[PDB]
């Protein structure tokens, strides 16, 4: 039950419905805390392979050394800390969608490998000899500006274009004020039920504030700001009171 | 007897703790050295649902940056010359209970990440390989530095900030909680006057005003030590500008 | 269908029935691979395997390693012997994409093989023997690198025997439109779209557009159009905006 | 055999040492390289309520920085390297007794931090261990460097000092306690005389003076050292400028 | 195979390569990339008292510095390689044989020295070892650099230089051996015309002259190839300015 | 063999030696390069209560700083990077005898520090060991730098200098002992005249004046060599102004 | 038949003869290939222990971190792999002449430890505990200027001077013209016999050329450049033309 009631969002939602029934890689960009994952997540549930696996893996939480192998996999002989070939996530999510967060953290080496896989659907295991071919619906995401990284020499130009087929720009909460009040209201519901609190909703005075806050964290920060406000809540409503504590 | 909270902003912070009771979202505590951060964590946990459960407090500074990512989590055998057994973890020891990471800013980028992954997934692996353990530990970070700043310095992962920034408590230095200095004074005095066996009863309007004026840069940490001293050299029941001045 | 590619299809044809290395120069996306991939199909060995490896998808140091194989502990971390991608491609054809990334050593080793067929698994004492069809394809200006001492002179020359310079799409106008269709046909065919073709309206911005990304960017831009396509045709609208 | 406390300050200190011994907070001893800082500590122990309990004393610079925390708190099976046995770390070795940490300023911020915790909690985890060890250690801190200076350079944990600077004892150099120079000189004279089997009964006043006109950059240490040197080169029953002048 | 030594100097070199045939004194060969050094080495081998013996030939440039010494001198167990049992090395491989070092210039310094010994004593130390390995190797080396300036530049050990150089052979470039050009040219053509099965027989005075003219900076190597190309793009029975110009 | 002390200060030392050879305190022999600094400690041995005990003489500079602590105090088991067995530190070697550290100038601030302990407590720990070994070694510290300076620079623990200073003993260059110079010059010419079987008995009057002028910066040693050469190129029964000239 | 028929050379030959009878260190300087090792070798053939072992050893071709251990030997445990206890070349050379060549390479700690041997004649087997005592006649040599080095702080001093005692300076052949022509004939004669060649000598034309060459490779270039000429030799002699190809 995810929210979509703003401008550029009820539009993106469409773009999702139209895309899903595709098989080319989608690229998602935006500031951390806008939906990227969610969006990617949906682009899956609607996709013709919704029932298929959704291997969503973070690129910033993984040692570069592990990742490159964690993803494509290895073969006895390239890893001196493990002997036995484990299938990379690619083979794991065979026929499924593979979402990589913060793409902008892929090795100039990983990226290359990636490209070859987006197009041929083929690749070699790390230290592999047999060409493994699979069926993965890649879903890039990132908070960083690729085009800027492309010039810095920190990212493959030809990898970007191939992902730029379907690109989705997620604008920050601060530019979807039509989302703050609905989302917030989502959250206030989640938590009010999660911590068994008789909290029904925000007051006008409060609703205003929520709309004025810049929400740097965006959707994320609001998620927290309200779990926090739900707990701090004393009566049935929330206004300038608990909120100001934060926002 | 009891503990000490009486100034408005703290009269408050106690409650915030009380409300947070029924929760488990990580908590980010911040105040100058000595302000009572680690005293709040401890209280948050005494109040959380898992009070009876363990409290695994670990100073992130009390361990060389190169061995933190070996003791917090754990260690998979033969990955570093000499391993008597894949190393357990403070995370694993704190499983089911609280894990109070003190002085967060002192986390290596590598672990800052590795923590994030465990704050969301809750699963972790000791070194290279995969997760094979289940840990249910409530994160409680406390730092005396300003997190936000560190974020523009790149020394602190932002996403890890907002993740711990679910509930955020900020302890104001003693010098702003003046209503606390005095009451916090007799608590201590009374404490050592016991442990140390001195007929000390209290302070003199003389000294009190002194205390209530001193800035206490190691707020409360200082106030505790200062007074532990002032009691040791006590002859008369009361303590005045005399025993404090030559010290403060 | 072109002023230079309808010609190249002949050099390829007049070559395939050969056995020496074929350099393939041109910007990113012209078809450097396709050509080679092709060159193979027409080669006396097209029935053999076509090992295709992206020089830059494997860490510099760890290359000669892979590409030429090593024995047991011939170095840092090598548990058990391995086969050089070359060997894998014995009899078949090897395609080294972006020859520009080969360490001055890899080059050094490459050459010797291309000139003797014999080499030494990295850290090996028996000389292995092979017959492989080398298909090099960079997008850089080797001749420069050579000067900047960033590439071996002699290596170039030996590869430069059969050089096939693929000009961009901004120099093959003849190919912009025929291709654009080829993509629309397949993309329409795949994404259940009732699209027939372009309107001279879009066929204009098309043949005009710089196409720095070459045939690839196109094979992309189109797929984007075929998706964001509505009716049966496309025009300045779809093509403009996101492109 | 005995001890020399005949100046104004020392005999004053020999009295604060008494008022303390019957306590248990950490005491920080400052003073140049020779004022007999250890001694003053060992004495506060021979008057303390655990005087029969052990007196663990270690030289903070006699163990490489890296092994220290490990040594000071111990470890078990495993650790970054070479750790293969359990060493209950010095601390425990003195549980109930007294720990003399020689020249603090050499501690690593890690150790400083880890220590500061033990001082207050009295509990700590073996490096690489999983059990919360508890001990009742009397920590006596001594250093020849100026801590406060160090705090500025950020070469020393602030709050650690405040935690040790409870009981601070400033032991001046010899060249400021003159009153002891001769009483002392005698003491060493008696001793080394006995020790080396000599007929040395005193110093001429020719010498009695050299000894007062020396800065003794090695307060007491250098004294004791000079004298013994003398008593050996001595010939008569009295030692005068003649023998000393070679040295002092 | 037929060797094209039909020039005034090359015809002379060959004699040298012959007069030199009866010894084992190291040989240093110098010339541009492709004037056929390895050839002249190979030939030096084929005419040497140890022709029916090995001829190991590695290209210093082909081996990354990380592994070369180890690749050339082998290593002993527990070598600086983090691997088990001892690997022999190209030197031993060439035992009794003739080792050919191509492009001597890239030889590391520590390397050149080691090499310097083997040339004298015939002994060397498996990387990270102790036993002293002896080998009866004939050394033929060559490079496309002018040594002296590397000796001067202090990039190439001096003494070393004066050690191989017992016998030195200068292989001029093609541009100074026009007498080889044409003959070479044919042999190549005859060789390719066959291998590829064509009807082409020779070159026209038209082209013959272009060939004699061209500078040939890729030396013989480019020749063999430029022609292999022609023989490829050959239609008629004779190759003339027509094809030769479409390239060179 | 033959001692040589006819000179005011030498002769005085020789006595300082003797008065000392009845004590087990640390003798900090001071002095230039080749002023007999060794002989002196060898002598302070031949006359000590343990002249029969071992005289362990180890050059604190012929042993690399990292392995120093190793060989000195000793090692336990696989403690450091390259440990295979339980080996005995040098101290132990000389247990009941004398450990003569030639030039404590080069002592890792750790060694120095770790050296102190041994000096006083007579006990020490084997690097990486748990047991506290104890020995009674007579330490003969022979530097040749100005310790006091090093102490300033910080390059020498201050309390170490004071623990070896108990009997400092300067040693005057040869330029400040013209008395020995010619005796020595003779004590040698003899030996070497014998050893090399030369019919040379002594120097001319001319000669000896030089042997007096010359400032022998290389001192006694300096002389020894220089006479040996002389004795060797010697012709007549006399070595005159000449022989000692073109070499001085 | 070793050559010594010129001024400074016939002179040094007299210094060698007197020396030999003497077990003292002897330093040897000169450019690469003047005869240092030859001299070092003669000082031994003439010493009162010529019948003894002459441990010549190349310092540069020996892993710096093994030298000492090689030199002084080691006792078990000395390092990982120290199974038994080997005994350095010193004990190898005992009773005779060891000969470090190019001294300037010893490590500081090496030069130190080296020293005490010169004086005491004792040294400690790496990680050893007993004093090993040998009777070796060190015969250092070098090509670098030690003096200059000491300054830089690369080479201990005492060791410098300790060896300085009898220092021998071999002069470049570019100053021993009198030796040239003689060396040549001895050389030609040699190879001319090793390869069964009809060579008898050189022509005035040749000779003059010789004596005109700087011989940067001093005596050790002349040795090659004659083996070369002796081979390429056609008739009975050798003139400008054959040596010009080299010189
Ligand atoms: N559009 C949305 N509607 C409701 N909740 C959302 C929405 N977007 C994000 N969230 C919530 O906010 C958090 C931010 O999630 P995420 O998708 O990972 O952000 P990002 O854009 O950085 O990838 C999620 O845990 C999710 O539950
Ligand atoms: N509000 C308080 N009431 C009573 N004691 C307190 C209070 N705050 C701090 N203290 C005392 O002050 C000391 C400093 O505690 P701590 O919170 O751990 O420091 P920090 O805030 O830097 O982590 C504790 O030993 C505790 O007993
Ligand atoms: N001549 C062509 N005909 C049809 N499609 C082409 C042609 N040339 C290139 N393409 C398309 O453009 C892409 C360029 O591919 P590739 O072989 O990798 O060339 P390059 O190595 O120059 O980038 C291919 O995926 C292919 O579908
Ligand atoms: N007041 C004193 N009376 C007798 N001896 C003393 C006195 N003070 C110091 N000493 C002696 O002086 C030397 C200095 O000792 P120490 O306590 O270790 O000083 P510090 O720790 O300041 O360097 C010791 O031998 C000690 O026993
Ligand atoms: N004299 C010659 N006769 C016939 N072929 C030659 C001759 N010289 C060189 N070649 C050929 O020319 C190419 C250049 O070879 P190579 O000996 O490796 O040159 P270089 O060592 O100078 O780099 C080789 O393929 C070789 O077979
Ligand atoms: N007093 C002396 N009488 C005879 N020989 C001496 C005397 N003092 C020193 N020597 C000789 O001088 C040399 C220098 O010896 P040493 O004591 O080791 O110098 P230092 O220890 O100062 O560096 C030795 O050969 C030693 O035998
Ligand atoms: N005086 C000489 N008499 C005969 N041969 C000599 C003489 N000097 C040098 N040589 C020869 O020249 C070569 C150079 O020898 P060497 O002394 O080792 O040079 P370096 O000065 O570098 O040590 C030797 O192999 C030797 O045969």
UniProtKB/TrEMBL annotation, chains A, G:
One of its GO terms (cellular component) is cytoplasm. GO terms for molecular function: ATP binding; cis-regulatory region sequence-specific DNA binding; DNA-binding transcription activator activity; identical protein binding; metal ion binding. Mg(2+) 2 binds at residues 37, 101. Keywords: Activator, ATP-binding, Cytoplasm, DNA-binding, Metal-binding, Nucleotide-binding, Phosphoprotein, Transcription, Transcription regulation, Two-component regulatory system. The keyword Chaperone does not apply. The chain holds residues 138 to 384 of 439 of the full protein. Mg(2+) 3 binds at residues 101-102. This is Transcriptional regulator (NtrC family). ADP 1 binds at residues 2-3, 33-38, 220, 223. Its main location: cytoplasm. ADP 4 binds at residues 3, 33, 35-38, 220. ADP 2 binds at residues 3, 33-38, 220. ATP binds at residues 3, 32-38, 143, 162, 220, 223. It is found in: Cytoplasm. GO terms for biological process: phosphorelay signal transduction system; positive regulation of DNA-templated transcription. ADP 3 binds at residues 3, 33, 35-38, 220. Disulfide bonds join 21-24. Residues 2-231 form the Sigma-54 factor interaction domain. It comes from the Bacteria. ADP 5 binds at residues 32-33, 36-37, 220.
């Amino acid at each position: 039950e995810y929210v979509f009631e703003s401008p550029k969002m009820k539009e993106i939602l469409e773009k999702i419905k139209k895309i899903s029934c595709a098989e080319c890689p989608v690229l998602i960009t935006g500031e951390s805390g806008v939906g990227k994952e969610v969006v990617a997540r949906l682009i899956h549930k609607l996709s013709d392979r919704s029932k298929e696996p959704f291997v969503a893996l973070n690129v910033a939480s993984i040692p570069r050394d592990i990742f490159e192998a964690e993803l494509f996999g290895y073969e006895k002989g390239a890893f001196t800390g493990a002997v036995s070939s484990k299938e990379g996530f690619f083979e794991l999510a065979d026929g499924g969608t593979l979402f990589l967060d913060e793409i902008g953290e892929l090795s100039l080496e990983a990226q290359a490998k990636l490209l070859r896989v987006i197009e041929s659907g083929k690749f070699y295991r790390l230290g592999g000899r047999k060409e493994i071919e699979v069926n993965v619906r890649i879903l890039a995401a990132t908070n960083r500006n690729i085009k800027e990284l492309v010039k810095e020499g920190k990212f493959r130009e030809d990898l970007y274009y191939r992902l730029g087929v379907i690109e989705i720009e997620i604008p920050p909460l601060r530019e979807r004020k039509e989302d703050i009040i609905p989302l917030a209201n989502h959250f206030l519901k989640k938590f009010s039920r999660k911590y068994a609190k008789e909290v029904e909703g925000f007051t006008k005075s409060a609703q205003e504030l929520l709309l004025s806050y810049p929400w740097y964290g965006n959707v994320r920060e609001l998620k927290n700001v309200i779990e926090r406000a739900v707990l701090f809540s004393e009566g049935k409503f929330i206004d300038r009171g608990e909120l100001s504590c934060l926002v």
